[PDB]
Ligand binder design. Sequence first.
Ligand SMILES: CN[C@@H]1CCc2c(ccc(O)c2O)[C@H]1O
Length: 281
Amino acid sequence: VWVVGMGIVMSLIVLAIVFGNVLVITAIAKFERLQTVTNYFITSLACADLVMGLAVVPFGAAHILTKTWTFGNFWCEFWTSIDVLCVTASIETLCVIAVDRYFAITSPFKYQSLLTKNKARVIILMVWIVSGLTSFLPIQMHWYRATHQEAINCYAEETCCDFFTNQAYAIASSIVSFYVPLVIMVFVYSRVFQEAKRQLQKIDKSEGRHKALKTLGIIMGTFTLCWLPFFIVNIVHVIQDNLIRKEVYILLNWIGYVNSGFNPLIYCRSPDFRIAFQELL
Ligand SMILES: CN[C@@H]1CCc2c(ccc(O)c2O)[C@H]1O
Protein backbone atom coordinates (compact mmCIF):
# COMPACT_ATOMS: atom_id res chain seq x y z
CA VAL A 1 0.00 0.00 0.00
CA TRP A 2 3.04 2.22 -0.52
CA VAL A 3 4.64 1.28 -3.87
CA VAL A 4 2.29 3.29 -6.10
CA GLY A 5 2.47 6.48 -4.03
CA MET A 6 6.24 7.01 -3.96
CA GLY A 7 6.58 6.31 -7.67
CA ILE A 8 4.25 9.23 -8.36
CA VAL A 9 6.55 11.58 -6.45
CA MET A 10 9.57 10.17 -8.29
CA SER A 11 7.87 10.70 -11.66
CA LEU A 12 6.96 14.29 -10.74
CA ILE A 13 10.57 14.97 -9.72
CA VAL A 14 11.89 13.55 -13.00
CA LEU A 15 9.37 15.47 -15.10
CA ALA A 16 10.03 18.74 -13.27
CA ILE A 17 13.80 18.47 -13.68
CA VAL A 18 13.57 17.53 -17.36
CA PHE A 19 11.04 20.26 -18.18
CA GLY A 20 12.97 22.99 -16.39
CA ASN A 21 16.31 22.13 -17.94
CA VAL A 22 14.88 21.68 -21.45
CA LEU A 23 13.13 25.06 -21.23
CA VAL A 24 16.30 26.76 -19.99
CA ILE A 25 18.37 25.21 -22.79
CA THR A 26 15.90 26.09 -25.54
CA ALA A 27 15.52 29.68 -24.29
CA ILE A 28 19.16 30.55 -25.01
CA ALA A 29 19.27 28.73 -28.35
CA LYS A 30 16.06 30.32 -29.65
CA PHE A 31 16.74 34.01 -28.98
CA GLU A 32 19.84 35.99 -29.91
CA ARG A 33 19.50 38.67 -27.22
CA LEU A 34 19.59 36.10 -24.41
CA GLN A 35 23.02 34.95 -25.58
CA THR A 36 25.82 36.28 -23.39
CA VAL A 37 29.42 35.31 -22.63
CA THR A 38 28.46 34.55 -19.03
CA ASN A 39 25.35 32.64 -20.13
CA TYR A 40 27.45 29.81 -21.59
CA PHE A 41 28.21 28.67 -18.03
CA ILE A 42 24.47 28.50 -17.36
CA THR A 43 24.17 26.41 -20.52
CA SER A 44 26.82 24.00 -19.23
CA LEU A 45 25.09 23.72 -15.85
CA ALA A 46 21.74 23.12 -17.56
CA CYS A 47 23.27 20.41 -19.75
CA ALA A 48 24.76 18.68 -16.71
CA ASP A 49 21.44 18.80 -14.85
CA LEU A 50 19.58 17.50 -17.91
CA VAL A 51 21.98 14.56 -18.20
CA MET A 52 21.53 13.84 -14.48
CA GLY A 53 17.74 13.91 -14.75
CA LEU A 54 17.76 11.82 -17.91
CA ALA A 55 20.12 9.07 -16.72
CA VAL A 56 20.87 8.94 -12.99
CA VAL A 57 17.43 9.37 -11.41
CA PRO A 58 15.11 7.13 -13.51
CA PHE A 59 17.49 4.17 -13.24
CA GLY A 60 18.17 4.79 -9.55
CA ALA A 61 14.44 4.80 -8.80
CA ALA A 62 14.02 1.25 -10.13
CA HIS A 63 16.58 -0.09 -7.66
CA ILE A 64 14.59 1.44 -4.80
CA LEU A 65 11.20 0.36 -6.15
CA THR A 66 11.58 -3.20 -7.46
CA LYS A 67 14.46 -3.96 -5.02
CA THR A 68 16.39 -5.87 -7.71
CA TRP A 69 18.99 -4.56 -10.18
CA THR A 70 17.46 -6.56 -13.02
CA PHE A 71 19.69 -4.79 -15.56
CA GLY A 72 23.12 -6.01 -16.62
CA ASN A 73 26.08 -6.14 -14.27
CA PHE A 74 28.34 -4.04 -16.51
CA TRP A 75 25.87 -1.17 -16.77
CA CYS A 76 25.84 -0.02 -13.16
CA GLU A 77 29.55 0.80 -13.12
CA PHE A 78 28.76 3.17 -15.99
CA TRP A 79 25.77 4.42 -13.99
CA THR A 80 27.92 5.25 -10.95
CA SER A 81 30.50 6.96 -13.16
CA ILE A 82 27.77 9.07 -14.78
CA ASP A 83 26.41 10.03 -11.36
CA VAL A 84 29.83 11.18 -10.12
CA LEU A 85 30.42 13.10 -13.35
CA CYS A 86 27.02 14.82 -13.18
CA VAL A 87 27.63 15.90 -9.56
CA THR A 88 31.19 17.18 -10.03
CA ALA A 89 30.45 19.09 -13.24
CA SER A 90 27.47 20.91 -11.73
CA ILE A 91 29.31 21.89 -8.55
CA GLU A 92 32.38 23.13 -10.43
CA THR A 93 30.21 25.11 -12.86
CA LEU A 94 28.57 26.82 -9.88
CA CYS A 95 32.04 27.66 -8.54
CA VAL A 96 32.99 29.09 -11.95
CA ILE A 97 29.87 31.29 -11.97
CA ALA A 98 30.73 32.58 -8.49
CA VAL A 99 34.29 33.45 -9.56
CA ASP A 100 32.90 35.20 -12.65
CA ARG A 101 30.66 37.31 -10.39
CA TYR A 102 33.64 38.19 -8.20
CA PHE A 103 35.62 39.35 -11.24
CA ALA A 104 32.64 41.36 -12.49
CA ILE A 105 32.16 43.20 -9.19
CA THR A 106 35.71 43.70 -7.88
CA SER A 107 37.28 44.90 -11.16
CA PRO A 108 35.07 46.90 -13.56
CA PHE A 109 37.57 48.32 -16.07
CA LYS A 110 39.74 45.20 -16.35
CA TYR A 111 36.76 42.81 -16.51
CA GLN A 112 36.64 42.83 -20.32
CA SER A 113 40.38 42.20 -20.72
CA LEU A 114 40.37 39.18 -18.39
CA LEU A 115 37.35 37.37 -19.87
CA THR A 116 36.55 37.07 -23.58
CA LYS A 117 34.30 34.92 -25.76
CA ASN A 118 36.85 32.18 -26.46
CA LYS A 119 38.01 31.87 -22.84
CA ALA A 120 34.56 30.52 -21.93
CA ARG A 121 35.10 27.46 -24.14
CA VAL A 122 38.49 26.78 -22.55
CA ILE A 123 37.07 27.13 -19.04
CA ILE A 124 34.12 24.84 -19.82
CA LEU A 125 36.37 22.19 -21.37
CA MET A 126 38.74 22.33 -18.40
CA VAL A 127 35.84 21.95 -15.96
CA TRP A 128 34.39 18.99 -17.84
CA ILE A 129 37.75 17.24 -18.30
CA VAL A 130 38.50 17.61 -14.58
CA SER A 131 35.06 16.15 -13.88
CA GLY A 132 35.78 13.28 -16.26
CA LEU A 133 39.16 12.38 -14.77
CA THR A 134 37.77 12.09 -11.23
CA SER A 135 34.90 9.77 -12.19
CA PHE A 136 35.40 7.55 -15.25
CA LEU A 137 39.08 6.68 -14.84
CA PRO A 138 38.91 5.44 -11.21
CA ILE A 139 35.54 3.71 -11.52
CA GLN A 140 36.10 1.87 -14.79
CA MET A 141 39.49 0.32 -14.04
CA HIS A 142 38.57 -0.42 -10.40
CA TRP A 143 40.78 1.54 -8.01
CA TYR A 144 37.82 2.21 -5.73
CA ARG A 145 36.90 -1.40 -4.94
CA ALA A 146 37.04 -2.28 -1.25
CA THR A 147 39.11 -5.17 0.07
CA HIS A 148 36.99 -6.26 3.04
CA GLN A 149 35.10 -9.54 2.72
CA GLU A 150 31.68 -7.88 2.88
CA ALA A 151 30.35 -6.67 -0.51
CA ILE A 152 32.85 -8.88 -2.37
CA ASN A 153 29.88 -11.17 -2.95
CA CYS A 154 27.86 -8.20 -4.21
CA TYR A 155 30.65 -7.29 -6.64
CA ALA A 156 30.68 -10.92 -7.78
CA GLU A 157 26.88 -11.32 -7.84
CA GLU A 158 25.15 -10.04 -10.96
CA THR A 159 21.94 -9.16 -9.11
CA CYS A 160 23.75 -6.84 -6.68
CA CYS A 161 25.91 -3.76 -7.03
CA ASP A 162 26.05 -1.25 -4.17
CA PHE A 163 28.55 1.55 -3.64
CA PHE A 164 31.59 0.53 -1.60
CA THR A 165 34.88 2.42 -1.51
CA ASN A 166 38.27 2.26 0.21
CA GLN A 167 39.54 4.87 2.68
CA ALA A 168 41.26 6.87 -0.09
CA TYR A 169 38.79 7.29 -2.96
CA ALA A 170 36.10 8.70 -0.66
CA ILE A 171 38.47 11.33 0.73
CA ALA A 172 39.82 12.26 -2.70
CA SER A 173 36.38 12.54 -4.30
CA SER A 174 34.96 14.56 -1.40
CA ILE A 175 37.89 17.00 -1.40
CA VAL A 176 37.80 17.42 -5.18
CA SER A 177 34.02 17.86 -5.34
CA PHE A 178 32.88 19.80 -2.27
CA TYR A 179 35.30 21.48 0.12
CA VAL A 180 37.48 23.54 -2.25
CA PRO A 181 34.50 24.96 -4.23
CA LEU A 182 32.77 25.71 -0.92
CA VAL A 183 35.77 27.70 0.33
CA ILE A 184 36.10 29.55 -2.98
CA MET A 185 32.41 30.48 -3.07
CA VAL A 186 32.39 31.56 0.58
CA PHE A 187 35.34 33.92 0.13
CA VAL A 188 34.01 35.29 -3.17
CA TYR A 189 30.54 36.08 -1.89
CA SER A 190 31.88 37.51 1.38
CA ARG A 191 33.89 40.05 -0.62
CA VAL A 192 30.93 40.76 -2.92
CA PHE A 193 28.63 41.42 0.04
CA GLN A 194 31.25 43.70 1.60
CA GLU A 195 31.49 45.75 -1.60
CA ALA A 196 27.70 46.02 -1.88
CA LYS A 197 27.43 47.18 1.74
CA ARG A 198 30.17 49.76 1.12
CA GLN A 199 28.29 51.24 -1.84
CA LEU A 200 24.98 51.23 0.05
CA GLN A 201 26.64 53.14 2.90
CA LYS A 202 28.30 55.56 0.47
CA ILE A 203 25.00 56.57 -1.17
CA ASP A 204 23.54 57.84 2.13
CA LYS A 205 26.26 60.50 2.38
CA SER A 206 25.09 62.30 -0.79
CA GLU A 207 21.38 61.44 -0.39
CA GLY A 208 20.35 63.31 2.75
CA ARG A 209 16.63 63.52 2.03
CA HIS A 210 18.58 44.07 2.50
CA LYS A 211 18.30 42.86 -1.09
CA ALA A 212 21.92 41.67 -1.12
CA LEU A 213 21.39 39.85 2.18
CA LYS A 214 18.25 38.15 0.86
CA THR A 215 19.80 37.01 -2.42
CA LEU A 216 23.05 35.78 -0.83
CA GLY A 217 21.04 34.00 1.86
CA ILE A 218 18.99 32.22 -0.79
CA ILE A 219 22.02 31.23 -2.85
CA MET A 220 24.07 29.90 0.07
CA GLY A 221 21.16 28.32 1.95
CA THR A 222 19.95 26.30 -1.02
CA PHE A 223 23.38 24.90 -1.89
CA THR A 224 24.51 24.22 1.68
CA LEU A 225 21.24 22.62 2.80
CA CYS A 226 21.26 20.53 -0.38
CA TRP A 227 24.81 19.19 -0.33
CA LEU A 228 26.44 19.67 3.09
CA PRO A 229 25.05 16.58 4.92
CA PHE A 230 25.90 14.13 2.13
CA PHE A 231 29.64 14.74 2.09
CA ILE A 232 29.88 14.83 5.89
CA VAL A 233 28.21 11.42 6.12
CA ASN A 234 30.34 10.23 3.19
CA ILE A 235 33.51 11.04 5.14
CA VAL A 236 32.25 9.80 8.49
CA HIS A 237 31.07 6.32 7.52
CA VAL A 238 34.52 5.62 6.05
CA ILE A 239 36.59 7.09 8.89
CA GLN A 240 34.94 4.62 11.31
CA ASP A 241 33.42 1.30 10.29
CA ASN A 242 29.91 1.46 11.80
CA LEU A 243 28.29 4.81 12.56
CA ILE A 244 25.83 5.28 9.66
CA ARG A 245 23.05 3.04 8.36
CA LYS A 246 22.46 2.46 4.65
CA GLU A 247 18.96 3.96 4.63
CA VAL A 248 20.14 7.32 5.98
CA TYR A 249 22.93 7.41 3.39
CA ILE A 250 20.46 6.67 0.59
CA LEU A 251 18.04 9.34 1.85
CA LEU A 252 20.74 12.02 2.06
CA ASN A 253 22.02 11.06 -1.40
CA TRP A 254 18.53 11.36 -2.87
CA ILE A 255 17.93 14.72 -1.17
CA GLY A 256 21.17 15.91 -2.75
CA TYR A 257 19.76 15.20 -6.22
CA VAL A 258 16.90 17.72 -5.92
CA ASN A 259 19.36 20.63 -6.22
CA SER A 260 19.73 20.11 -9.98
CA GLY A 261 16.00 20.76 -10.30
CA PHE A 262 16.10 24.02 -8.34
CA ASN A 263 18.96 25.65 -10.27
CA PRO A 264 16.82 27.12 -13.12
CA LEU A 265 14.55 28.86 -10.61
CA ILE A 266 17.46 30.18 -8.55
CA TYR A 267 19.64 31.44 -11.40
CA CYS A 268 17.15 32.25 -14.22
CA ARG A 269 14.60 34.89 -13.22
CA SER A 270 15.95 38.02 -14.95
CA PRO A 271 13.54 40.18 -16.99
CA ASP A 272 15.06 38.93 -20.25
CA PHE A 273 14.51 35.33 -19.15
CA ARG A 274 10.91 36.12 -18.20
CA ILE A 275 10.31 37.75 -21.59
CA ALA A 276 11.81 34.69 -23.30
CA PHE A 277 9.60 32.35 -21.27
CA GLN A 278 6.51 34.39 -22.17
CA GLU A 279 7.50 34.38 -25.85
CA LEU A 280 7.96 30.60 -25.95
CA LEU A 281 4.52 29.87 -24.51
C1 LIG B 1 25.88 6.52 -6.12
N1 LIG B 1 25.99 7.75 -5.31
C2 LIG B 1 27.28 8.46 -5.39
C3 LIG B 1 28.29 7.92 -4.36
C4 LIG B 1 29.53 8.83 -4.07
C5 LIG B 1 29.62 10.18 -4.78
C6 LIG B 1 28.46 10.76 -5.33
C7 LIG B 1 28.60 12.02 -5.97
C8 LIG B 1 29.81 12.68 -6.07
C9 LIG B 1 30.99 12.14 -5.54
O1 LIG B 1 32.18 12.74 -5.60
C10 LIG B 1 30.89 10.86 -4.87
O2 LIG B 1 31.97 10.30 -4.35
C11 LIG B 1 27.12 10.01 -5.22
O3 LIG B 1 26.24 10.44 -6.21
